[PDB]
Write a protein that binds this ligand. Structure first.
Ligand SMILES: CCCCCCCCCCC[C@@H](O)CC(=O)O
Ligand SMILES: CCCCCCCCCCC[C@@H](O)CC(=O)O
Ligand SMILES: CCCCCCCCCCC[C@@H](O)CC(=O)O
Ligand SMILES: CCCCCCCCCCC[C@@H](O)CC(=O)O
Lengths: 333, 49, 332, 334, 63, 72
């Protein structure tokens, strides 16, 4: 909690300009910060707003320092410095503290040192929890599943059998990992189930949001690269493969057997077709209708934005009949 | 003649079940049939006549 | 079970029939029978009312002529329907008593007539108001505060430092106060931004199932009074929803979005972040909300279905609408 | 672990065995990853020329595939189907639970059938009926007076509300909610007055439901899921939705209230379907479908303009907005 | 100048049996027909467009 | 003409005239979004009855850059 500004500036490799004996109690926004609070500023436009901010210290760039109206920590990337200093003064609790007796742990489960299991959490057989692992309350970890060192589950997370989670991963509540993929063969109208015997491999330093679903593979595995981040309400179907350090926002639906490359950034509520591949360093804007593969990096977009209803009604009808007008235009030529 | 077209496409909204796209599309369909460039049956019949 | 006359007064309805009739529950026109009360709202349904074997039918003063049984005359049948369905509600409670199976921290303070379901978990510092019900398998994080009369169905997740008002209802699978999607890009790599903000939910808020409302980064995410949220919704960090605004199913909201009050977000709508939507706005289904909305009204988007072979042509011509625009001008 | 003679398997699958029938099969795998002791399959004729690269002991294929075979072959007419069958015979998938867990909470009014298993910390309410061979996953909740037919299985952390009826041989993945209040509210001068949902969810036989999907109870009448229906993850089935037998709903589909879907339909993922309407039989809706209106004739239906490079889309978008402008210029050009 | 065959092949290569050997989308075969219509200033009835499933078939139509 | 182009920017971009200075960037100073710069070009094309090639439209990121094209 409470720390000294000068010491804090050292841990952030920052340029302390002002009283170093200033005691910082926490982090806050410009709008809201008071005394004991350190904040930051990423946009140059909010330079004037520094004279309305009751914060003790503001993280800015060297070119912002003339505008400073308080103590200042200068850096190259205020936003990254915010991330770091926020971690130091992080008020966030843990999913649990050590092993709750309320839990139901199978005798064959192999625990690391300093493992925590939440209340009424259920661990199946053959499960291996690494060192400093934290299982939130009401969680369920399936048979023979591996969770790497320092990884943590919030309350009510579901991990199926044979799942492999790397080191220092975080999973928010409601999320389900390793459920049957949507695999069905058709016999004369009837659906015959295709047992999904693949798994989910999750790399290191992967963070998944809440109420997200990553299905196990049909035969081979579903793989999440390292340093990957996924938001809430995402659907990641069987046999999808995601490259290291890729980002997926909220509400993304991925079809099966999709390969997403490294350092991609998938916009929210986007919808991605399957059995195809996306190259490295691709950015799909929100609500992206990704019907085709993407071979070259860059930004891709789709979807007509909002219009007033009466305007839309007429916009929609003309597009639906755009072929008719394309023809009566071709004739006019 | 107009009325048969209305029936094919489908007060339009209150009695005959129209959606937001249909009343616009209905006007468009009359433009083609009658080649010429209104919320009830009666309003359509009288104007067009 | 109630008498039609004692029912007619609780709904402030003009009774037009035998007031000593016994009512047992609510049902639809097409399937209601003796013992049952129903309602109709669409004028087209008048000439079919006699076929309804309901004991009594809620309607208007204008529907009264076509009445074919005991009538309850009101101004808003749908509203009257809602209240008479509440009086005759058959829905149970998520829990009664406090379960021995439930795990409750010592530092947690409970009110009166509080119920906690089986195997539910209550962390430290939690305040539960009077007549508050926590369904089975639920989780309530540290220092979270749940106001009076609020109910959680089975398997709900409340994180730490969350504030729920009075008379709220949260369905199952729903998560409140999970880390917002906050990450700094350290040269390709993602560094986590701890989300130390909160979720403030007001009074009379109802939330559907498998919905996620994230805590704010530093400042708070706010769900105003009387707001209703459906299932499968994503309400990101630092979103602020005005009072009595309604959010239908499958809606994806970006962070730092401000929605005014009395707004109606159609389902599957997708709303961009760091902008405002003013009061009294309706967004239709599958809405693509890219820009702010400054004045009230209805806003829509999307090109609907066509037979597959037609869509193909529609699609390809639009993707080349530019060329088609060039052709148009070159002919002027 | 499983183990079976290639001959026995060929017989169980009704296949023409081309090769050593004494080969022992231990499981099923992909061509890329297959090992000795594994069987795989081939549907796409592009993989023909590659068949030599495979280390599988046997490959399931067709008659026209046999010439390119470089292993023992199980010839059939529909490989993807026999793959599905043999995948079942060699299934490794464990059970949601075995026997009755002590930590579980089962009300004494609960009627438990024969050979029923309930996992750890699961919660069975009053008046519940669980048929024979039913498996309730750990951490589940089953509301008052709900019945689950024999053979049906719930994985961990599934939520079933009250008065919900599930047929037999059903399967529901974790995170899924069945029987929650439909989105029913009456408006009183700005404010929302709740409409209690006293209807139910009726789920048929051999129905499979994905993870974190929500199927709401009807307002008065019932929400009905037909037999053989399969529903993927992240789906929303509104109150009073009726879905016909053998229909498929892929992931992330948003269904409105009082929607009726016929039999043998395929609703593509991320599709969004309006309410108080009907979709006929044998209808296929492609992904990201914007089903604004009813469908009366069988067939394939689609909507949506796919991706373009951002700079291109900016201009494509802006133009479609100004489309009424176009049709006024064109018409004036006549 | 340029032969018919060469012009057809050039259009195909730029746009991308179309579906099996090459890898057509539900749009590409349509877009290909439209591009062929433009290059050769001709209207292709969908009954005939529907018959264009190979490289040769495209060559054949124009021929 | 300078004034007229500038008037369009204010209407399209929604800013008072005093803010639309010659050295101002549409995106960086004036808040413009993914579609406004395109819509602005469209508005200029209509007002001044001219077709702007995309190689050049892409280089018009400030008002002054816009004034110069139009004068030419
Ligand atoms: C032109 C830029 C459009 C961006 C496309 C969507 C970016 C993909 C979302 C990744 C989420 C991270 O970014 C984390 C954050 O931002 O909180
Ligand atoms: C259609 C316009 C684009 C709409 C983008 C919607 C993306 C939704 C992202 C939700 C995840 C948030 O946690 C990310 C944030 O903090 O924003
Ligand atoms: C073409 C897009 C049509 C818009 C679809 C909106 C779907 C919204 C989900 C409705 C959830 C139901 O529980 C409420 C209801 O529907 O009564
Ligand atoms: C742009 C059209 C693409 C539409 C794809 C929608 C996403 C499909 C949901 C994933 C379902 C998978 O579990 C089944 C699969 O696909 O294998």
């Amino acid at each position: 909690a409470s720390i000294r500004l000068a010491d804090l500036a050292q841990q952030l490799d920052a340029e302390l300009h002002g009283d170093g004996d200033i005691v910082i109690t926490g982090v806050a926004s410009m709008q809201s910060a008071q005394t004991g609070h350190i904040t930051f500023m990423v946009n140059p436009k909010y330079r004037e707003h520094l004279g309305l901010c009751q914060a003790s210290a503001v993280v800015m760039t060297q070119d912002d320092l003339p505008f400073a109206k308080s103590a200042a920590l200068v850096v190259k990337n205020p936003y990254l410095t915010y991330a770091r200093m926020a971690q130091i003064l992080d008020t966030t609790p843990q999913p649990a503290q050590n092993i709750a007796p309320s839990a139901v742990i199978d005798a064959t489960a192999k625990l690391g040192n300093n493992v925590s299991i939440g209340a009424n959490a259920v661990i199946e057989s053959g499960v291996e929890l690494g060192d400093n692992v934290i299982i939130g309350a009401g969680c369920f970890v399936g048979k023979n599943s591996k969770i790497g060192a320092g990884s943590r589950l919030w309350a009510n997370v579901t991990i199926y059998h044979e799942i492999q989670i790397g080191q220092n991963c975080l999973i928010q509540s409601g999320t389900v990992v390793g459920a049957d993929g949507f695999g069905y063969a058709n016999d004369r109208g009837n659906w015959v189930k295709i047992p999904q015997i693949g798994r989910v491999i999750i790399g290191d330093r992967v963070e998944i949001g809440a109420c997200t679903t990553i299905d196990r593979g049909a035969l081979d595995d579903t793989i999440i690269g390292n340093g990957v981040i996924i938001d809430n309400q995402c659907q990641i179907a069987h046999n999808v493969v995601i490259g290291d350090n890729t980002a997926v926002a909220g509400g993304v639906i991925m079809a099966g057997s999709l390969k997403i490359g490294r350092y991609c950034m998938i916009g929210g509520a986007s919808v991605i077709n399957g059995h195809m591949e996306i190259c490295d360093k691709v950015t799909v804007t929100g609500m992206g209708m990704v019907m085709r593969p993407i071979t070259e990096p860059g930004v891709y977009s789709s979807g007509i934005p909002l219009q007033p209803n009466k305007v839309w009604r007429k916009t929609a009808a003309l597009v639906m009949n755009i072929d008719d007008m394309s023809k009566r235009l071709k004739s006019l030529e | 003649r107009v009325k048969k077209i209305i029936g094919e496409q489908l007060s339009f909204v209150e009695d005959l079940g129209a959606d937001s796209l249909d009343t616009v599309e209905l006007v468009m369909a009359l433009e083609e049939e009658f080649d010429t460039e209104i919320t009830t049956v009666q309003a359509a019949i009288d104007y067009i006549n």
